[PDB]
Amino acid sequence: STGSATTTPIDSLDDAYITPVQIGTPAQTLNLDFDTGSSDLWVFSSETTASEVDGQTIYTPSKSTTAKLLSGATWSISYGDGSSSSGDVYTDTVSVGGLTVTGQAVESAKKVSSSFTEDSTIDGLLGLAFSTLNTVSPTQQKTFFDNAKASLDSPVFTADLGYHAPGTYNFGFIDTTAYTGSITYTAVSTKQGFWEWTSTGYAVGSGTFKSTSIDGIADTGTTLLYLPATVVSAYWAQVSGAKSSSSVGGYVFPCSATLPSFTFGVGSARIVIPGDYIDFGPISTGSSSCFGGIQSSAGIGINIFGDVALKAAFVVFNGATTPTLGFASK
Ligand SMILES: C#CCN(C)Cc1nc([C@]2(O)CN[C@@H](c3nc(-c4ccccc4N)no3)C2)cs1
Incomplete structure (x- = not known):
């Protein structure tokens, strides 16, 4: 079926x-x-x-x-x-x-x-x-x-x-018509009950790729992309005026900014999140401060590839005897 x-x-x-x-x-x-x-x-x-x-x-x-x-x-x-x-x-x-x-x-x-x-x-x-x-x-x-x-x-x-x-x-x-190129599959750990995998690194905008293992979960129920504070700081450092606000609860940036893309690694493949996907708009109606779609996972205990990341990809949740995750560009 x-x-x-x-x-x-x-x-x-x-x-x-x-x-x-x-x-x-x-x-x-x-x-x-x-x-x-x-x-x-x-x-x-x-x-x-x-x-x-x-x-x-x-x-x-x-x-x-x-x-x-x-x-x-x-x-x-x-x-x-x-x-x-x-x-x-x-x-x-x-x-x-x-x-x-x-x-x-x-x-x-x-x-x-x-x-x-x-x-x-x-x-x-x-x-x-x-x-x-x-x-x-x-x-x-x-x-x-x-x-x-x-x-x-x-x-x-x-x-x-x-x-x-x-x-x-x-x-x-x-649905082989729903994505471009090939699907790259990557190992899943079920030890915490999640679709938990290890990204191979990241890039910001047009920058080179930083190879680094990022253990996290593919979570359609989480809105944003939560990554280690090091990675998140490297991203927002490229946006003039962006800073982490304790009162707001995360990184904010001037609504006048155009955001850089963010790339994450899936094995040797790459998923590119367009900058616009990282814009969550004014923190309150009429505000010129906008909420960022990439936030630190430091207080969470786990990195979360939420909707910001997943919506840039066609994602396969493979529930075979050895589960895996697949990501394709689209
Ligand atoms: C802190 C900490 C450590 N650890 C628990 C973090 C994790 N959290 C999850 C989630 O509970 C499961 N996927 C996310 C979800 N959120 C909502 C939601 C939808 C509407 C309204 C409110 C909601 N919360 N629905 O799904 C959250 C997975 S790992």
Whole structure:
């Protein structure tokens, strides 16, 4: 089997991308944030504390003839930015772009933190990291991809995120028309439950390539590119007036600047992030200070190749027995 679904930025900054997902019978379509950095499929629901719902579409398991309570199962998750959600668990039929999994764990939120309440366009998350990170207790649950994997034509999914534009998640096949050149595959460590790999280095703008190993994760659920403070400083040093602001929470730069590109290495290949992809616009409406799309990972503990990086590439998440990641230019 295969599936293919369009993913759409939630706003003009590409802060996150949402993909329609059919849950239950008859289908209840929710727009979920596909997150290769986590492993829970959770949704706003009829059980979510009413004061914490602000315009999201909710899943109502009582209206699904295929929903079953996963008796005694609870979940609770906290994300890298401090946001969180928790609740109980149903199993139900979940379909993405024509690909159907029966008995998928659908984690129904009883509580969500403020950032989720404020994102009226995100109805939940669909985790695509390794199932070892799934938070359901006492019986850990598999991701949608893990459940679908054996049925797929090939045990892969691909992320083709757009720049200020829709993109595509495909399951079970590689769309050879969606990228230029060849896909360079690179080894993955699953030891932390992530799509964790080692970039071979970087370049800033037209500069030469700096060969250096950068261990990080391919995370569609993170907006920005988080890299070691050394690399990030070398990038922003090329932008007149750019500096790290403690009050703002990262590097800012004059909105009057044109940004240099940033290249990252995948083996001997190179992915070039255009400078415009690193511009996240005014820190507040009307400000002439703009927020940078490349930020330091120093306080995070791990480097994160988030959407800023991934949207410059066609990315293959190869879930074969030995997982790998593929990157192609596009
Ligand atoms: C600090 C530290 C150490 N370590 C935990 C960092 C990591 N964090 C992650 C993520 O939790 C999983 N991929 C990212 C994500 N973020 C959101 C999100 C979407 C909407 C609103 C709020 C959100 N947080 N959805 O997915 C964050 C992976 S590694």
